[PDB]
Symmetry: C3
Subunit: 157 residues, 3 copies
Amino acid sequence: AQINASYQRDMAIALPGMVADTSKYNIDGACVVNEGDVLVGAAVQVVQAQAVDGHKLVKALTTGTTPYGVAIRSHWQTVNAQNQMIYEDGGAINVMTSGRVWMLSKSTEAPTFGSAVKLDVDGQEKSDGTIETTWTYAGGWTKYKDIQLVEVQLHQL
Amino acid sequence: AQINASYQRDMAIALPGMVADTSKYNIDGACVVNEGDVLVGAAVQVVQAQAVDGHKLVKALTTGTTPYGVAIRSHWQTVNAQNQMIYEDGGAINVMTSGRVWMLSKSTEAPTFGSAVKLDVDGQEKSDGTIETTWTYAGGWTKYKDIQLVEVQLHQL
Amino acid sequence: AQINASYQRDMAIALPGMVADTSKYNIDGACVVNEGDVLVGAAVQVVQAQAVDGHKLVKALTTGTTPYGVAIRSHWQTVNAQNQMIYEDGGAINVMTSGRVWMLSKSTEAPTFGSAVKLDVDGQEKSDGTIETTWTYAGGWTKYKDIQLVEVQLHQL
């Protein structure tokens, strides 16, 4: 005769640029894309903070700049482009200034627990990045299909 | 006959010693003004913390002392004097130890976004002040009538 | 006849390993005792953080290790041993990463307010302990029967 068979599959753990736990976090609205496009799991620099109006003009991280926060994942604000989710010019952003988020990584080795995070020129985590941050790792280290992700603990500037 | 007219006026943004945003903030009660009077928009110092009872004895900032927090604005707990709001000797006082608040300042130029806040010998922000804090600027820079205000970001000691 | 009399007595302020105030605190679950037993009012160390599962392996402080948090009193997750409340091996811990807690101290002198906290080898507060922490004192200094307690303010790593 025949022997019946059963299969089992486990879902992934996380997707790029999404929150990790329900710990204390502080997301910031009232942020505008001054120029260009911002990926969901990437660092963000502040070009200028308005005095009277109060909006903060943000931009993608570049060389010789201090990171401020990381964009997060939302199904309403984000625009569908480049086979992913991005924030377009002249639109609001949800930037996380504190908490734990799943970032994008160009690294190939698992990190430690309480070491400082280093970012490269385009705002993605790298083992030997030139840009130094005050954030620390959190322990999470997984990947989604062909995309590598890492968990990072952010602190307020 | 006649041409009708319509006018337009705008309200101010903030008042001295007023909470700026709804971000993560911590307000510490159970504090007593040991001596003197404390203005609403000024920093304070902790003279002594009681071991058993637990009331912290606060005082207006002086020379060579570490600031602790900024008094906040309340219509019930504050007495009116010198055409301003103050906290009198004795009685509870609300001091903010974390969050965004508007502070009195004697500076005349706009401050940068991320930079350490320096205060003078009486607790008002000054660009070339002597006392150095761990707080950082937030971006707000306005003026109510003839009073100059500035927004700062506080951190727990 | 007789003269009637009335008496009065007072309670104790705190018990070891219990939360002091309702300020901004963050209690992290998802922790398991890797080896040994952990007291309620003692610090812990992070042996290893799992990359995929997410649980953090915790232990007792030793020589040369950096503290992470302080165990938290509870009436359900803690067993009673040595006529005291204690966490056992292979069980969930309620480690407090930020906030105010009543620790165990072997010092004999009252501390200051803003000075840094030094711990000893076994993870209890000591006036001249070798291990250096980023935490700061709060002010509480009491004694329950024959056990000395001290209040401390914690910060996220």
